[PDB]
């Protein structure tokens, strides 16, 4: 092992560092907003259809309970 060998390794370590890391939280925030909008968008169909069929607005709830003829 020579000192030139180790100094070249140190220089290449420094060069391999310093790689600029761009902003990434904006991408995550935008994806979260898109996911939320895509999650709550189909619920417009449920509310509108239930209101069209006469189901009371107070009877339109959120859950996995089996919807009856009066509750959705």
């Amino acid at each position: 092992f020579t000192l030139i060998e180790l100094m070249i390794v140190v220089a290449i370590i420094g060069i391999l560092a310093a790689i600029a890391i761009p902003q990434y939280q904006n991408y995550v925030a935008r994806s979260e907003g898109a996911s939320a909008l895509a999650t709550i968008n189909p619920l417009k169909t449920t509310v509108e259809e239930s209101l069209s069929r006469g189901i009371a607005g107070s009877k339109i709830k959120i859950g996995t309970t089996a919807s009856t003829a009066t509750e959705t």
Partner: protein, 71 residues
């Protein structure tokens, strides 16, 4: 008998109330739970006078009122 049940149309019930003099009306009252909120509890009345004149009166919104029925 008219041949249909009062609740034959699920939107609302139908009531026929004709007096002996010939005056009467035929009403269609939308029922809550089976009709849209805009039309709920609204009545479409086919009033008949003792002289045999038929008229249609509706309590719905003017935009939703069908043609030929006054609002």
């Amino acid at each position: 008998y008219v041949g249909v049940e009062p609740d034959a149309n699920k939107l609302g019930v139908i009531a026929v109330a004709i007096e002996d003099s010939g005056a009467g009306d035929i009403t269609f009252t939308f029922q809550t739970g089976t009709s849209s909120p805009k039309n709920a509890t609204k009545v479409i009345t086919l009033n008949r006078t003792a002289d045999g004149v038929w008229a249609c009166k509706s309590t719905q919104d003017p935009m939703f009122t069908p043609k030929g029925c006054d609002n």
